[PDB]
Scaffold this active site. Structure first.
Site, PDB file in Angstrom:
ATOM      1  CG  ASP A  92       8.089  -8.710  13.626  1.00  0.00           C
ATOM      2  OD1 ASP A  92       8.645  -8.212  12.624  1.00  0.00           O
ATOM      3  OD2 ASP A  92       8.966  -9.308  14.463  1.00  0.00           O
ATOM      4  CG  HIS A 128      15.306 -21.412  10.398  1.00  0.00           C
ATOM      5  ND1 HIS A 128      15.915 -21.740   9.240  1.00  0.00           N
ATOM      6  CD2 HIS A 128      14.113 -21.193   9.856  1.00  0.00           C
ATOM      7  CE1 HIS A 128      15.085 -21.532   8.139  1.00  0.00           C
ATOM      8  NE2 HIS A 128      13.990 -21.389   8.334  1.00  0.00           N
ATOM      9  CG  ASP A 143      10.902 -24.767   5.348  1.00  0.00           C
ATOM     10  OD1 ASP A 143       9.977 -24.888   6.196  1.00  0.00           O
ATOM     11  OD2 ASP A 143      11.359 -23.929   5.041  1.00  0.00           O
ATOM     12  CG  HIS A 189      12.650 -20.325   4.787  1.00  0.00           C
ATOM     13  ND1 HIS A 189      11.161 -20.648   5.010  1.00  0.00           N
ATOM     14  CD2 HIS A 189      12.677 -18.734   4.570  1.00  0.00           C
ATOM     15  CE1 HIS A 189      10.732 -19.240   4.642  1.00  0.00           C
ATOM     16  NE2 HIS A 189      11.631 -18.236   4.428  1.00  0.00           N
ATOM     17  CG  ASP A 212       8.056 -22.593   3.574  1.00  0.00           C
ATOM     18  OD1 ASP A 212       8.571 -23.647   3.537  1.00  0.00           O
ATOM     19  OD2 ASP A 212       8.528 -21.887   4.836  1.00  0.00           O
TER      20      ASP A 212
HETATM   21  C1  LIG Z   1       9.934 -22.172   9.689  1.00  0.00           C
HETATM   22  C2  LIG Z   1      10.355 -21.137   8.751  1.00  0.00           C
HETATM   23  O1  LIG Z   1       9.725 -21.193   7.750  1.00  0.00           O
HETATM   24  N1  LIG Z   1      10.609 -19.830   9.010  1.00  0.00           N
HETATM   25  C3  LIG Z   1      10.897 -18.856   8.121  1.00  0.00           C
HETATM   26  C4  LIG Z   1      11.382 -17.560   8.783  1.00  0.00           C
HETATM   27  C5  LIG Z   1      11.474 -16.301   7.938  1.00  0.00           C
HETATM   28  C6  LIG Z   1      12.021 -15.232   8.194  1.00  0.00           C
HETATM   29  N2  LIG Z   1      11.715 -13.989   7.501  1.00  0.00           N
HETATM   30  K   LIG Z   2      14.954 -26.712   3.139  1.00  0.00           K
HETATM   31 NA    NA Z   3      13.135  -9.128  15.408  1.00  0.00          NA
HETATM   32 ZN   LIG Z   4      10.580 -22.261   5.622  1.00  0.00          ZN
END
Ligand SMILES: CC(=O)NCCCCN
Ligand SMILES: [K+]
Ligand code: NA
Ligand SMILES: [Zn+2]
Ligand SMILES: [K+]
Length: 638
Positions: free
Chosen positions: A22, A137, A174, A176, A267
């Protein structure tokens, strides 16, 4: 008063991984933890932290943020074979399961709760939990984006329930969007959530309309959700610091949280394949530092994402360095945020202007990959040296020390017989030996970082301090002066920037920031507004090698001086010399306390004078073309 920094970590959280192909999930690996801890060990940081064991979050603790139906389903994954674990994972977006991941998710959650307890019981000042799986998330009834349970949401809900906290700040740096945290607290005004995130006009995962700047919370929670979307990749240190000075920090110090929790994904650092940003690991030293005057330093840093094993270890180290109070590294090359960031910044400031005092003036017309290795950081043997008036002894913190050699005394006589012929007052001549002696320890020795000297005559004191710094050489010197009148400071050649807090007003020099704050009960809000939105942006862009603090004796200083000398230590590796004119026991003790890295008492509560806001924005207008980090709108193109 609490001391020390907790480090919560356990090898067990590295014992689950992806078991099928994956490409979306394969970046989330056990080695994120192992590389991060080993980086802390290599640099001697782990050994300086209080190790606190992990525990399992209990069922009741998991139910604070998750549904019984979702917990029950996850609780069955330890019994599942590979085929069954793949089918279960495919019910969710960008997350994989493993026989051991339920165990590890309870440990990540328990580790976070352990961190909250250690900080809130005053057993440590602050701390960090290196956990897998990440959390921000995950949602009430869903795993999402490598996250099973919402570690940081647990921490805020647990701190509310068990310590009766009314105001918690969650900072999610982060790359995201932590939509699970947003949904958790969107109606709750007791938790303020701030997130910046790669968005690219909703084309970047998780592709949600509600990750945009217009989601401000709902109902009684309106205004306590702040989203700052990044609509291009490649954001830099300047973009991140512009976000902090012009969005996050003004709101954070107004909110006055009782606890700060960081959703710390790295990240957002240069090199990361998910973020594609360009901020250096050193910036996290400052993001941590700028938040530490909040909540008397009670900060719980919780690992989220971060996938470039090298930028990961270095950004973890920069964060713990700052938690431990080590001197911040100098950030060079700062300037304006890029246009796309300035657009995101002006947009969030505009929509938030209905809710926050710092932004309120915007609402009406009347008011409106390879990068260098980070250098070494290490605490000075004696952090702060103090020179009180002769005879006065004080109770000093264990990392401070009182003040005069023959080398130095010859220099003072040389300086006297050249520039102050008629000087015989051996008390002034004493302070000159103290200034030179203290500065030499600050600049030459790694053993002393900063210092404070009580003086009597400002002119000779300031001249000798400044001129001795400029010939050492210190390429650039930032002077912060609280008082009226003119000092023997020339700001014409670019080696000096002068911030002056006065009462009169002013000048046309662009190497000078003069802040005439009206007297009254609103000066604390006005000063803090100037500090975060004007003083810090300019100081950071200037990048001085020394900071010279000067307080006139005639001069509501006590309420804000501690915040300033704490935050201004983000410049010049903390190398600050403060000259106090006249003895004031309280001001001298607070100066030493903040210079030595002690916690700063919270400000508590309000709103600033419109005349002061007008005065401050006129300064921004006058200076932001030279000092672009001041900018919090897109410039008008010709
Ligand atoms: C914890 C984190 O940074 N998750 C990122 C998920 C990426 C989905 N493409
Ligand atoms: K963030
Ligand atoms: Na998936
Ligand atoms: Zn992230
Ligand atoms: K909220």
């Amino acid at each position: 008063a609490a001391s020390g920094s907790a480090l919560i970590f356990d090898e067990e959280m590295s014992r689950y991984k992806l078991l099928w192909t994956d490409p979306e999930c394969e970046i989330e690996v056990p080695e994120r933890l192992t590389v991060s801890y080993e980086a802390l060990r290599t640099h001697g940081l782990a050994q300086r932290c209080k190790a606190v064991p992990v525990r399992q979050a209990t069922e009741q603790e998991i139910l604070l943020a998750h549904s019984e139906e979702y917990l029950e389903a996850v609780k069955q994954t330890p019994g599942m074979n590979v085929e069954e674990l793949m089918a279960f994972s495919k019910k969710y977006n960008a997350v994989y399961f493993h026989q051991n991941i339920y165990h590890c998710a309870k440990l990540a959650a328990g580790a976070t709760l352990q961190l909250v307890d250690s900080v809130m019981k005053r057993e440590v000042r602050n701390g960090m939990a290196l956990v897998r799986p990440p959390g921000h998330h995950s949602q009430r009834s869903a795993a999402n984006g490598f996250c099973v349970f919402n570690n940081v949401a647990f921490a805020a809900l647990y701190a509310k329930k068990n310590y009766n906290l009314n105001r918690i700040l969650i900072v999610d740096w982060d790359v995201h969007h932590g939509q699970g945290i947003q949904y958790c607290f969107e109606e709750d005004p007791s938790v303020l959530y701030f997130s910046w995130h790669r968005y690219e006009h909703q084309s970047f995962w998780p592709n949600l309309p509600e990750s945009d700047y217009s989601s401000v919370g709902k109902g009684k929670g309106s205004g306590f959700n702040i989203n700052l979307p990044w609509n291009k990749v490649g954001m830099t240190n300047s973009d991140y610091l512009a976000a902090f000075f012009h969005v996050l920090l003004p709101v954070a110090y107004e909110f006055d949280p009782e606890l700060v929790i960081v959703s710390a994904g790295f990240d957002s650092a240069i090199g990361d394949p998910e973020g594609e940003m360009c901020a250096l690991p050193e910036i996290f030293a400052h993001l941590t530092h700028l938040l530490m005057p909040l909540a008397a330093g009670k900060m719980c840093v919780v690992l989220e994402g971060g996938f470039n094993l090298t930028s990961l270890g270095q950004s973890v180290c920069q964060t713990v360095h700052s938690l431990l109070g080590d001197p911040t590294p100098r950030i060079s090359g700062l300037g304006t945020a890029c246009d796309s960031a300035l657009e995101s910044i002006q947009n969030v400031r505009n929509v938030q202007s209905s809710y926050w005092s710092s932004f309120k003036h915007l609402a009406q017309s009347e008011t409106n990959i390879v990068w260098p290795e980070p250098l070494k950081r290490m605490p000075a043997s004696v952090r702060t040296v103090v020179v009180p008036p002769p005879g006065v002894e004080l109770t000093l913190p264990k990392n401070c020390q009182h003040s005069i050699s023959e080398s130095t005394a010859k220099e003072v006589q040389r300086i006297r017989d050249k520039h102050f012929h008629d000087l015989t007052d051996q008390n002034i001549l004493r302070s000159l030996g103290n200034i030179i002696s203290v500065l030499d320890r600050m600049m030459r020795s790694d053993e002393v970082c900063n210092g404070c000297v009580v003086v009597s005559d400002l002119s000779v004191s300031v001249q000798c301090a400044l001129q001795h710094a400029l010939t050492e050489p210190a390429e650039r010197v930032l002077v912060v002066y609280v008082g009226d009148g003119e000092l023997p400071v020339k700001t014409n050649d670019g080696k000096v920037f002068l911030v002056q807090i006065c009462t009169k007003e002013e000048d046309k020099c662009v190497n000078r920031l003069t802040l005439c704050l009206r007297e009254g009960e609103s000066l604390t809000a006005g000063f803090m507004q100037a500090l975060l939105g004007l003083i810090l942006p300019v100081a950071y862009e200037f990048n001085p090698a020394l900071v010279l603090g000067i307080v006139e004796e005639t001069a509501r200083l006590m309420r804000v001086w501690g915040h300033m000398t704490c935050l201004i230590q983000g410049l010049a590796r903390g190398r600050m010399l403060t000259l106090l004119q006249g003895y004031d026991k309280d001001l001298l003790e607070l100066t030493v306390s903040a210079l030595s890295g002690a916690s700063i008492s919270p400000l508590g509560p309000r709103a600033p004078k419109p005349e002061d806001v007008e005065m401050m924005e006129k300064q921004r207008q006058r200076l932001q073309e030279r000092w672009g980090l001041l900018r919090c709108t897109v410039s008008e193109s010709w």
